[PDB]
Copies of this chain bind each other. A is one copy, B any other.
Amino acid sequence: TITVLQGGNVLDLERGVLLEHHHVVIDGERIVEVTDRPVDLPNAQAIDVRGKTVMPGFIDCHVHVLASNANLGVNATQPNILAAIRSLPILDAMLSRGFTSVRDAGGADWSLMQAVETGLVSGPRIFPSGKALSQTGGHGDFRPRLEPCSCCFRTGAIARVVDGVEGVRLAVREEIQKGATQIKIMASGGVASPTDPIANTQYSEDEIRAIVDEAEAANTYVMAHAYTGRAIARAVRCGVRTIEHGNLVDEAAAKLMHEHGAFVVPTLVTYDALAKHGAEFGMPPESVAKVASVQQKGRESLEIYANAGVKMGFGSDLLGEMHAFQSGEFRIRAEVLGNLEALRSATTVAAEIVNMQGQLGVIAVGAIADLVVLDGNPLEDIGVVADEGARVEYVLQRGTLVKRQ
C-alpha cells in the first residue's frame, strides 16, 4: 500500500525555498508524487502535516556508531558482545534526531548494516567502512609509547594496523569482501591517538595509491582523515575522494581539492565537545592537549572551502556520551555559511558523497522515502534542526514511519 503526507511545506534544496501546502505521495519505499493538488487518496495512510516542514532525512557522513566511550583505546578492548550492545542506543538516538543514513568511518561492519535493513535493530542505514586503515604508530594505532599486536578483530576496534603496499592491498580486498561500502584511511596524525602529533603525514604515496586503486576496482572510493594542507594535498593527488576533518587547509590545497573534485567533511562539533568534556569523559590527558589547536582554524577553514568552491558534507565524529551533541553541527555551520548551506551539507551534498545522488537527500519523484517532518522552518531558524531531536516529530525511512514524537 501507500502513504500521503498531506499539506506540508516541502523543502526543495536546489532552489532554496519552502513549497507550501504540497502533498507528497509514498508508494512502497519510494516517492511517487510531489504536488499541491488535492490528491486522490483512496487507501492511503494520511498523516496530516499542515503548517510543518517536510524535508529529506539527514545524512551524517562521519560517525563512529561503535564508539561507545571516548577513549578509543579502551573502546577497542571491551568485549565483543558488550561493544555491540552499547551501539544500539547510539543508533536509536541518531535516528530520532532525524538522521536516516550514516556513513560510519570505522567500526561498523556489514552485519550492523544488515541488522537495520532487516529491521532487527532500530537506526539509520549504515554505509560501513569496516575498519579504518592505519599505519603503525598511526592515528589508528592505540598502543602506548613494545609491539607485536593482535591476530583478530575486536568488534570495538575503530581501526586496524597495516603497513606496506601488499599489506594495504590485501586489507582493502579483505574489507570489501567483508562488505564495506567505502574505504577509510588515516593519512595524517590526529587528536584521539597516543603517539602521533597532528602536523605529520601518514602512509607513503605508494600505499595510498594502492588503496585508492583497490577501492576503485570494487567501484567505490577512499575517504581520508587529514588535517594540514600538506597532508591533504598529497592524499588528494593520490586520488582520495573525500577528506575528513581538514581543519588546517591553506587555499592552495583547497584549490587543488576543487580542481580534483574532492569533497570535505568537516566535523567541528566534536572539537567543542572535547573542549568542554574532554579529560572529563575518559580521553587521555595528552589527547586533550591536541584538541586546543584544531578548533581554532576550524570555523575559519569553512570559509576557505567555500571560497575555493569545495563541496562540504555533514559530519559529527562524536565519541561516547558526547554523542548527544550530534545535531549541533548544523548550528555551527549555519553561523559561518547560510543555513541553506548547512542543510545542503546533510542532504544533497551528502547524498552525492555516498553515491546516492537522486536516491537520497532529495524530495523528488523516484527517490527513496527518507523523510523528516519538522515543526517550524529551518531555512529561517536553524534551531529547529540543531536542538537535538527537539522539534522533529515524524521520521520516515524507506516508506515506513519509524519515529513519532
**Residues of chain A having any CB pair with chain B under 8 Å:** 79-88, 109-112, 114-115, 120-121, 135-138, 141, 143, 145-152, 155, 163-167, 169-170, 173-174, 176-179, 195, 197, 199-202, 204, 210, 213-214, 217-219
Q: B136 touching A174 by the CB < 8 A rule?
A: yes
Q: B204 touching A219 by the CB < 8 A rule?
A: no
Known: A136-B177, A166-B165, A177-B147. A204 touches B200 (CB 8 A): no
Q: A163 touching B169 by the CB < 8 A rule?
A: yes
7 nearest interchain CB pairs?
A137-B177, A79-B111, A164-B166, A81-B84, A84-B84, A152-B152, A136-B173
Q: A178 touching B146 by the CB < 8 A rule?
A: yes
Q: B81 touching A115 by the CB < 8 A rule?
A: yes
Q: A217 touching B201 by the CB < 8 A rule?
A: yes
- The residue in chain B whose Cβ has the minimal distance to the Cβ of A220 is B200
A204 to B211 CA separation, bound complex (whole angstroms) = 11
Q: How many copies does the complex hold?
A: 4
A219 to B200 CA separation, bound complex (whole angstroms) = 6
Cβ-defined partner of A179 (8 Å) among B111, B145, B202, B219: B145
Q: Which residues of chain B have C-beta atoms less than 8 A from A138's C-beta? A: 173
Would you give the shortest CB distance from A155 to chain B, in whole angstroms?
Answer: 5
Cβ-defined partner of A177 (8 Å) among B120, B145, B166: B145
Q: B166 touching A195 by the CB < 8 A rule?
A: no
Q: Which residues of chain B have C-beta atoms less than 8 A from A111's C-beta? A: 79-82
Would you give the shortest CB distance from A230 to chain B, in whole angstroms?
Answer: 10
A177 to B143 CA separation, bound complex (whole angstroms) = 9
Would you give the shortest CB distance from A156 to chain B, in whole angstroms?
Answer: 10
Q: Which residues of chain B have C-beta atoms less than 8 A from A176's C-beta? A: 137
- The residue in chain B whose Cβ has the minimal distance to the Cβ of A204 is B213
Would you give the shortest CB distance from A75 to chain B, in whole angstroms?
Answer: 14
Q: List 21 A-B contacts (CB under 8 A).
A: A79-B110, A80-B155, A81-B109, A85-B88, A85-B121, A136-B173, A137-B176, A138-B173, A143-B177, A145-B177, A147-B174, A147-B177, A148-B149, A163-B166, A163-B173, A164-B170, A166-B167, A169-B204, A202-B217, A204-B213, A204-B214
Q: Which residues of chain B have C-beta atoms less than 8 A from A88's C-beta? A: 85
Q: A80 touching B80 by the CB < 8 A rule?
A: yes
Q: B80 touching A120 by the CB < 8 A rule?
A: no
Chain B CB within 10 Å, residue with most, of A86, A141, A176: A176
